[PDB]
Ligand binder design. Structure first.
Ligand SMILES: *[C@@H]1O[C@H](CO)[C@@H](O[C@@H]2O[C@H](CO)[C@@H](O)[C@H](O)[C@H]2NC(C)=O)[C@H](O)[C@H]1NC(C)=O
Ligand SMILES: *[C@@H]1O[C@H](CO)[C@@H](O[C@@H]2O[C@H](CO)[C@@H](O)[C@H](O)[C@H]2NC(C)=O)[C@H](O)[C@H]1NC(C)=O
Ligand SMILES: *[C@@H]1O[C@H](CO)[C@@H](O[C@@H]2O[C@H](CO)[C@@H](O)[C@H](O)[C@H]2NC(C)=O)[C@H](O)[C@H]1NC(C)=O
Ligand SMILES: [Ca+2]
Ligand SMILES: [Ca+2]
Ligand SMILES: [Ca+2]
Ligand SMILES: [Ca+2]
Ligand SMILES: [Ca+2]
Lengths: 391, 391, 391, 391, 391
């Protein structure tokens, strides 16, 4: 009975289009804050960040002042979108295709004339994502808020501390904080200045999934490709293994390339690792070809180099009537056998050379693989941190 | 003729913006309920739940009271969205990009002044999905409803029992119930408190599809990889089989990783199983390399260890003129043959050692595989339940 | 000149919110029909049906009655959405995220007061799809229409026969008919009853695509895997073939699982077929291992079982001075040769055993494959029908 | 100053809901045309066509007539959507989920009372796509326009020639023309007739991409699978090659099936080609098995057929004291050698038979492949055309 | 207090529908500019460009002129969408499905009557993308702006220089500039002319990602396929390697075809490279078949060509009582041995021929591969530029 009379009274001569103030040349103060319920999702490929937040706008209005004595028991009044005045605050860097995801909600007012506006939102923003240290990476995403048609001479934004109290953990990221900052900028459009409020979300990725799904299989594959050397040449399965491994590695590179963005600013870590692995395996294939070349060789058809063989041997050693016709034919067959034996002995020497080559290159490749893996993974700053918590 | 007159009369001096009550300081009561037609879908990857429900809001209005004697035969009247007052009840935890999926429908009123509002909706909600026990998993999804600009001093929500009578079975989940709960919370925004109504859907996954599509092939693949040992070394297909199996297993891991979320909170069961399988197969490859190492070996080039061979043998046994020239040459060839025979015998000893190694490691790996499979699958609490119904 | 005057006259004292009738307590009659232009699409995975239809609502209005003599030459008048009264008829079981796809169009009226409303629509509906007999399957999809805030005491729905005259063939389904049915239900919300109109679309899938793309390759793959037996053990390609076939079959199972829903209500046919095929091929691999076990075997190292060999043989047969030194050495070498020959003969016996095993298991597996394929495909009721038309 | 007065004057007593005419019983004439800027896209799978066009509606209005002498210098006036009357012309066969993609724009008027309305649009339409001759295919897509609530007695549509002057080439299709046609139809809804305007777009696909990406690899794969015959049986790589080729072909069939619709109306060309290729390769595998069967064969274990061998040979030929003990033992070993030689000779005969089988079946399969490829590709009507322009 | 009075005064007799000018026949001037914040994304497949920009419209209005002395301290006033007049400027070539992505914002005015309108937007445009030189490619995308219902006689567009000051680098493209141009066109719709403003964005792709992900593996694969020749025929892994490589190359072609559009206008570079690689590898397979044909060959079964062998040899050379019975049998066995030796020697000659063929074709294919790679990659104009910056 009093609420109705008050509602009649307030909009007697109102006009939403005016900035409500006692002095027309004195700027108005608006307190702007953010509240962050959830980190909905992150997309590296498209470079977008989806978040669920509540804005918080507060400002005092002169006209909507009423006395509590004449109107009893009524403390708070509400007004919808178009009936009163609201600041047209919205996101500068959006990717929503509608550009304003705010669900227009009510406005609360109390006798002094204060006014609150907490519009929720599922906001999409255009971060700049970097993968120089993927998966051991930390990301900085800035949300930039400000007014559009109102400037410093006519509006004045002041920042309050954000709110992470209701924050719900995501399960794929860790939140340090969302520090805020105010600035005044000078756009090449207009005379008067324009302020802005920037909140810088810091996130750290939890690496258990990407550590138990990518890295461990990669190291195991490298181990398997190292294990090829020991397989003796007699078994014909010496090179099918390596080629199958390379095909598997190619599949793996497809997988990882799908889940990463195409940024040419800086080369990523995981790409360095994959490149090293493929080069190592290719050199393994080449060495294996050399080995099978030495192993199969006709002693009578060819000969042997000197310097190579002697150096190889040194390195290995340090590391490790009618009766007359009868006689004639028997002599012949025995000589045949002796020649065969000598040929076989030379072949055996060839084979020993092949085995020593195998062993030497095996040790070399094991050392190279171990060193490269360790160095590449140590290169990441956050590694020491990420392994202490996630594991 | 009377309907028209009533409609004229009721909106003579109405204003939608007022909370309709006899006493302005006395709070209003609103009865809120839910009805659940269908569980539209669930998405583990994005962690979202899509449901089809009918809200149920009921409250009494003082102004829309009319006498039935003067207006005859008219019992119920209807009012659209903006003409009368409605509570702005909406979902707190939404993922719709429009944030309010409710299809604004009519409002029904009867002479006492009671009012009903049943707006339907395809609601999306941000559950927290867990896969610690996938596929034998049970999920708890909470839907949180409440008002936005109205508090306890001005509105009072009371909960009625939900409705699963019209529920349509999904074919991929089982519904236990949707218990509801009321609470009062204190947000770091405002002085007065705010209530909320939370419904906790419990779902259990039916495992026939995921049991006949994933687990059975995995066990069969492990069996095939066990069957490699028995393949004798003479056939060159001893290691191509295992490597092909590993490539297939990698493909399988791709498949499963696509259909699972990237949560680092806790390691999942199926990942434990896959890790065990890949480690087992890798050790199988290594053992096979060792076997082919022993089998192919030059007796004259090398020798044999003692402790290893004797222990191996024990374990196996418990488990299982010119005429003179003629004579000279004949003597020579016979001695050659005897030496060849001795070499062959030593080679045979090597081969027997290889076979016994094969058998021993085969039994060891069979035991390990069986034990690990059984233990990993027993680890799931719900297993005993899920196998009784689904199968 | 007369149209304008009529339009002025009709809305002189109108109000869209009243149910237009002579008697306020007498219910109104509404004739509701459907017309079906196209079956836009079907999605098994999400269980949705997308259709293009035209509603048909007809009802008489008392107020919009005018005399044709005073207003000459004007027969039909039109009214847009909010100016007159329309029944809020909409789909009960929708999946559109907007929940009302109807494109609000005009309303036609003629002097007696009759009114037509044909709003088009691309409607999405939540069918219950079943794949127990895929691809030889028939589907029943129900569209449920009714009013929301109007009941029997205040509205009365009557059904007319649907319209398939304009129906456009799809190319992937066949339409039998869309029988309609009326019912009155009692929802656990309200006192008065509520009617509903349900149209049951029946569809049959045309199988040429899925018969020439899935089944034929499957049978050919089974044939190829049968052809492995005949490959003699000497060629080392006896088991690579089968394993490659199994990998291909796994790929095929991936393909089919992608295009099918995850319903645990009932096991599907195609899954039965695939399971049978994989089990058959696995037993083939095992048999091949056994064969290569017998073929490669040292006669001197081991011996032979009796019962197995004799039974195998029976089944096959039914189915199919210095001179003294010279003499000594010659004697020795000849004895050596004789022993070698005997060993070779025993080896030949082993090999013959392997070949007979091959043949027997080949026939067994051919019989099993043929019988299972024929039985599984006959199991489908619609098969006899689907092969008469589609092929 | 005059524009304002004119705008006041015109809407003094207007009502958008009336059909504007001098005579109420005389029908109105509307000139309807289309203009086609771009062929946005085509989707075979869903059977949809996305286009960018400008409608062109023209009609004369009686009320908006003004004298140019009293109002000077003002020639054209503009009116937005709801202020004046417009015909509710829209697409009959749409797939947009909003059903009317027209961007409501202004309306232009000139003193005589003529009125223009050119609303742009990105229209989606439900073509009927056919792939009987893919990729050498020509497509007919019909766009059907007409009014909804206005008939012949009240509206009269007349068609003007379309406009392809601004047409922008797509790069994946070629446009012949868009002939238009008018018709009057009799829907089973209503008494009065209803006209319609149908434009029939004709498109021809440019085949360079699909000719250099699909066909050429297919023919090369068939060539490689032909090249298997020449590989001699001694090299164990005779059947791995063919099976790998078959796996590749399966992958290719997956690729092509993804990019084609599931229409069972008629079998497509590319499917015929793939079926022929797979059957050819399967018979190749079978022949290879036969060859390896003959090549490996124990002469003593078995014998040889007569008719087959003789016919094969003909076709090939047309196409292409103590001393006594010493003597005894020597006799024995020599007889042994002679028997071995005879066995080897019989084996050689077997091998020659295998080689001749290889050659004969090779020529047969080459002839079959060439003939089938040529015939299948000639079968397409448009082939001769498509190869003259695209290449 | 003055703002309110001014707002009352200005809209006393306003009408948004009039073009505001002193003279009704004199055209109005509008200054149009663009500002470019970000290049959101590019899609080659669908041929679309997504950008984030700010329009800039400026024009003077006669009615909204007020004196600053009477109204003190108020300099700028604001007006929302429908209250005042705005030019309906929008994109001609759009792909948004809503066709106008502009977020309608306020309008700023100052006493002289000047008016600004800066509506932001995430605009989608239909470029024409070309891949003739992918990845070393430069793209020209034109954005075409203009008015719809207003012409030269009634509106006059003038262009200001664009703004790239706030431009944010993308990380996948480089921006040269966005030159603008004005034109007057004559559409086949209307009498009066219509202007337009076209901005031509130039972009250059940064190639590090596509250079380290595609090209390097391709060259390594070609190297591996070259390395097959050196593998001696004795090892049975001579052709499995090449076929596995071809399968990998097919997978790679799938990958690249997915990420490229299906434009038949002109053949692309990367396709030329892939075609060359596959042809080279196929000829490699054929050569390998020839080699294995010569290597395995029965000397007694056949003979040798003359011209081929002699030319091959020249090119290689330039490049690089009872006792009588005893005697009889001994004679026999010795003759047997001699014949065997001669056969073996002829076989050795065959094998040497095979090896020389291997070497010659190896050098030929290495030369061909090197030349083709170098020539194909040099063919790109931008290559020399792109390698200087990106690397
Ligand atoms: C109306 O709302 C304002 C906004 O909070 C209230 O003003 C606050 O009052 C408390 C009480 O001492 C102060 O601590 C705060 O500093 C005040 N706000 C600000 C921004 O300074 C006010 O009390 C409310 N009630 C009335 C009747 O005005
Ligand atoms: C108003 O618009 C109409 C529509 O075009 C104009 O009428 C055309 O005038 C030309 C000039 O001779 C004729 O060739 C056309 O045939 C006319 N249109 C039609 C549909 O017949 C008219 O000139 C314009 N101006 C005025 C003042 O009416
Ligand atoms: C209102 O806005 C106009 C638009 O800029 C202002 O006019 C500009 O004034 C400066 C000052 O000398 C000139 O350099 C510009 O050339 C003017 N604009 C144009 C388009 O020529 C004007 O000063 C503003 N204030 C008032 C009171 O009119
Ligand atoms: Ca992510
Ligand atoms: Ca699921
Ligand atoms: Ca389907
Ligand atoms: Ca296409
Ligand atoms: Ca791109």
């Amino acid at each position: 009975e009093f609420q109705r009379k008050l509602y009649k009274e307030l909009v007697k001569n109102y006009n939403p289009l005016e900035r409500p103030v006692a002095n027309d040349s004195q700027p108005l103060t608006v307190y702007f804050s953010l509240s962050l319920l959830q980190i909905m999702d992150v997309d590296e490929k498209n470079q977008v960040l989806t978040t669920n937040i509540w804005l918080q706008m507060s400002w005092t209005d002169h006209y909507l002042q009423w006395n509590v004595s004449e109107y009893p028991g009524v403390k708070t009044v509400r007004f919808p979108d178009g009936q009163i005045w609201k600041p047209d605050i919205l996101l500068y860097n959006s990717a929503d295709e509608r550009f304003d995801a705010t669900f227009h909600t009510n406005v609360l007012v109390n006798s002094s004339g204060h006014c609150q506006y907490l519009p929720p939102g599922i906001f999409k923003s255009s971060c700049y994502i970097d993968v120089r240290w993927f998966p051991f990476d930390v990301q900085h995403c800035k949300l930039k808020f400000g007014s559009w048609s109102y400037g410093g001479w006519s509006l004045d934004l002041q920042m309050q501390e954000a709110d992470i109290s209701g924050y719900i953990p995501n399960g794929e990221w860790d939140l340090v904080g969302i520090p805020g900052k105010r600035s005044e900028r000078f756009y090449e459009c207009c005379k008067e200045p324009y302020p802005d409020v920037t909140f810088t979300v810091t996130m750290r990725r939890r690496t258990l999934y990407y550590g138990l799904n990518l890295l461990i299989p990669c190291v195991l594959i490298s181990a398997l490709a190292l294990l090829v050397f020991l397989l003796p040449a007699d078994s014909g399965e010496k090179i099918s293994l390596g080629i199958t491994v390379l095909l598997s590695l190619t599949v793996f590179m497809l997988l990882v390339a799908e889940i990463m963005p195409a940024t040419s600013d800086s080369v990523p870590l995981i790409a360095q690792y994959f490149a090293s692995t493929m080069i190592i395996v290719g050199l393994s294939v080449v060495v294996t070809v050399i080995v099978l070349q030495y192993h199969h060789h006709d002693p009578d058809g060819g000969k042997m180099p000197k310097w190579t063989r002697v150096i190889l041997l040194n390195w290995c050693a340090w590391f490790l009537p009618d009766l007359a016709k009868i006689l004639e034919e028997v002599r012949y067959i025995a000589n045949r056998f002796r020649c065969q034996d000598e040929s076989e002995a030379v072949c055996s020497e060839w084979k020993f050379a092949a085995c020593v080559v195998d062993r030497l290159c095996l040790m070399a490749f094991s050392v190279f693989t171990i060193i490269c893996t360790i160095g590449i993974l140590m290169s990441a700053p956050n590694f020491v941190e990420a392994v202490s918590k996630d594991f």
